[PDB]
Design a protein around this motif. Structure first.
Motif, PDB file in Angstrom:
ATOM      1  N   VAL A  26     -43.606 -20.925  -3.111  1.00 11.27           N
ATOM      2  CA  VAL A  26     -44.699 -20.837  -4.072  1.00 11.27           C
ATOM      3  C   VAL A  26     -44.160 -20.687  -5.492  1.00 11.27           C
ATOM      4  O   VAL A  26     -44.684 -21.291  -6.436  1.00 11.27           O
ATOM      5  N   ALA A  27     -43.089 -19.908  -5.662  1.00  5.99           N
ATOM      6  CA  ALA A  27     -42.516 -19.728  -6.993  1.00  5.99           C
ATOM      7  C   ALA A  27     -41.929 -21.024  -7.539  1.00  5.99           C
ATOM      8  O   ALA A  27     -41.951 -21.257  -8.757  1.00  5.99           O
ATOM      9  N   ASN A  34     -44.905 -22.917  -8.804  1.00  4.66           N
ATOM     10  CA  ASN A  34     -45.552 -22.328  -9.967  1.00  4.66           C
ATOM     11  C   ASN A  34     -44.659 -22.240 -11.200  1.00  4.66           C
ATOM     12  O   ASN A  34     -45.181 -22.119 -12.316  1.00  4.66           O
ATOM     13  N   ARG A  35     -43.339 -22.289 -11.042  1.00  8.68           N
ATOM     14  CA  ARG A  35     -42.442 -22.024 -12.160  1.00  8.68           C
ATOM     15  C   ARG A  35     -41.355 -23.059 -12.379  1.00  8.68           C
ATOM     16  O   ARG A  35     -40.728 -23.044 -13.444  1.00  8.68           O
TER      17      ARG A  35
END
Ligand SMILES: [Cl-]
Ligand SMILES: [Cl-]
Ligand code: NA
Ligand code: NA
Ligand code: NA
Ligand SMILES: [Ru+3]
Ligand SMILES: [Ru+3]
Length: 129
Positions: free
Chosen positions: A109-110, A113-114
């Motif tokens: 997920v990171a 998202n990033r």
């Protein structure tokens, strides 16, 4: 072990992660930065009771055995503690299975998202690779 940025990039490349499933090395370094800040000993408990382990925060719900995640699987066939070693081999081999599972690096997920859609090559810029 807390890796340096270029040190981790080099270890990841030696273990065959550079361009694995089409994901350039900077994607993997970026994911590790935001998952663990390059610390192999990182652990974090999830709301569902599972735990994420190591530089790439691999989850005990599906990927490793920690003995305390009911109903989980161990698809990488490893104790979760193996993902905390200073030697990143176990984390890399398991990450290769995860990223091949269908959703690519969106499994992290990171990363989505990033790192996704950013200038990920910055994470390997200047490194002797
Ligand atoms: Cl890159
Ligand atoms: Cl995030
Ligand atoms: Na850094
Ligand atoms: Na498990
Ligand atoms: Na378990
Ligand atoms: Ru699946
Ligand atoms: Ru599968």
């Amino acid at each position: 072990k807390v890796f340096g940025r270029c040190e981790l990039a080099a270890a990841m490349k030696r273990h065959g992660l550079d361009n694995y499933r089409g994901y350039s090395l900077g994607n993997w370094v970026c994911a590790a930065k935001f998952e663990s800040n390059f610390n192999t000993q990182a652990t974090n408990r999830n709301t569902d009771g599972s735990t994420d382990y190591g530089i790439l925060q691999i989850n005990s719900r599906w990927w490793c055995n920690d003995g305390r995640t009911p109903g989980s699987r161990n698809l990488c066939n490893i104790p979760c503690s193996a993902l905390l070693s200073s030697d990143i081999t176990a984390s890399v081999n398991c990450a290769k299975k995860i990223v091949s599972d269908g959703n690519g690096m969106n499994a992290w997920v990171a990363w989505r998202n990033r790192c996704k859609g950013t200038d990920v090559q910055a994470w390997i810029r200047g490194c002797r690779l």
